[PDB]
């Protein structure tokens with residue numbers, strides 16, 4: 061539900077699914 | 092991977108996630 | 123006289139996941155209605171709409187920007203410049219969407235707010251999209267954002283803490299977004315952590331659902347992340 | 352002379368998940384190159400690009416159309432008509448994307464195909480987007496599609512069965528899409544089930560990876576679904 065309701069979740073879902081080896085962006089949970 | 096690579100998977104992923112009670116559309120797996 | 127068709131045409135746009143058009147199916151709702159007391163249904167559709175449109179841009183932004191950093195780390199100016207100009211298009215798009223909702227929120231939505239929770243929602247919403255501007259802006263516009271954000275969030279907080287119960291979704295949601303504003307935009311982790319726990323504790327003593335439960339979990343996750351490195 | 356920047360600007364558009372622009376970053380690739388032998392990288396980017404753009408439309412289509420059926424089931428003409436006209440916009444969009452790739456595929460891509468697998472891919476691709484048209488069309492255009500599709504797929508099959516090994520990804524992928532074409536468009540489950548098992552069996556005796564493995568599983572899933580009700 062975190063990747064379904066927050067920007068942080070969707071970003072981390074996309075970045076891991078695309079195999080992009082760039083360093084993890086700092087972000088916090090917000091609605 | 093089925094909802095990540097096929098139209099059928101993505102359609103069935105979206106339709107279930109939105110709570111839409113309409114009858115399931117007939118479809119087959121294609122790339 | 124029948125503005126109910128646009129309510130129906132937006133539910134389709136949401137269902138088909140075409141969000142930019144749902145915004146248009148909701149811009150009409152606020153204007154054709156004129157200046158009426160806007161319902162719970164249409165508000166959430168407007169909320170969901172603009173949030174999803176913006177969300178799609180910010181996601182694009184935060185990815186593009188993070189690719190640009192791994193490129194400045196190698197010093198490839200011919201690569202970075204093309205990334206940045208592409209980001210320029212996204213930043214330009216973002217500006218317009220915010221410069222679309224805010225004065226529409228200003229013109230027909232903030233003035234026509236009756237109940238206690240309605241005023242909090244819209245003011246929180248104002249503070250939100252102002253904060254969304256602060257993410258990418260640099261100049262005098264950036265300072266104006268952080269200022270307009272701080273004023274809008276505090277204006278909402280006063281009504282939220284007093285008029286509404288500690289376990290009310292938006293009172294925590296406001297507190298959650300207010301909490302990120304300090305940490306992300308104002309770079310002061312101190313005042314952020316304090317407001318985060320304070321809104322959490324008061325909601326705990328009240329506990330004694332669904333939407334409220336989820337937001338508390340986001341607060342706790344932020345604290346544990348704001349106390350890591 | 353440097354068309355490599357558009358290869359780089361499309362990888363960004365993919366990464367940021369802005370697919371309609373990646374198409375444009377790839378339309379330039381085929382044209383600025385002129386008529387050159389197109390690489391494995393740029394082809395897959397063009398494939399992924401147009402497929403993702405179309406995919407987003409077909410998803411919208413199949414949802415909208417399925418809402419329209421639950422509405423004709425109640426006979427609400429005032430509801431159905433607004434759904435249909437919205438579908439009219441999506442169908443119009445779909446037409447243009449197909450009418451964009453196909454003659455571009457015709458002009459610079461099919462004629463400049465050298466190797467055995469290259470000709471199969473592009474012809475399969477032609478058969479694909481022609482089939483994508485057949486999904487929503489009705490008139491003389493619909494018949495022209497099913498015809499152009501059948502001719503393109505069979506033209507590809509002849510090269511695929513002979514020039515390439517039974518376990519080669521596109522030889523099965525073609526067979527998979529060819530198999531759906533019969534069942535979905537031509538309404539004949541018989542010739543569909545036969546081609547499906549035939550391409551499966553020949554790939555099995557060969558077995559003795561990754562991309563090939565996945566497609567076989569889609570074939571088996573279709574058979575078990577085409578023999579249910």
Ligand SMILES: O=C(O)c1ccc(N2C(=O)c3[nH]nc(-c4ccccc4)c3[C@H]2c2ccc([N+](=O)[O-])cc2)cc1
Nearest residue numbers: 065091162166169170173174291292293294295296333
């Ligand atoms: O940005 C989003 O993607 C989004 C938008 C609306 C919602 N909302 C709901 O799903 C929902 N259910 N009930 C309400 C609601 C409506 C009127 C008053 C109070 C709650 C909502 C909204 C919703 C929930 C929580 C917050 N909040 O405190 O940040 C705002 C909007 C959640 C997320």
Ligand SMILES: O=C(O)c1ccc(N2C(=O)c3[nH]nc(-c4ccccc4)c3[C@H]2c2ccc([N+](=O)[O-])cc2)cc1
Nearest residue numbers: 096122391395398399402403520521522523524525562
């Ligand atoms: O429609 C899509 O979303 C899509 C697009 C491209 C791919 N492809 C890959 O991920 C991939 N990896 N290697 C290849 C490849 C490239 C040149 C020759 C053979 C394989 C691909 C393509 C891909 C895989 C399978 C098929 N197929 O047989 O339907 C087409 C394109 C998969 C799905």
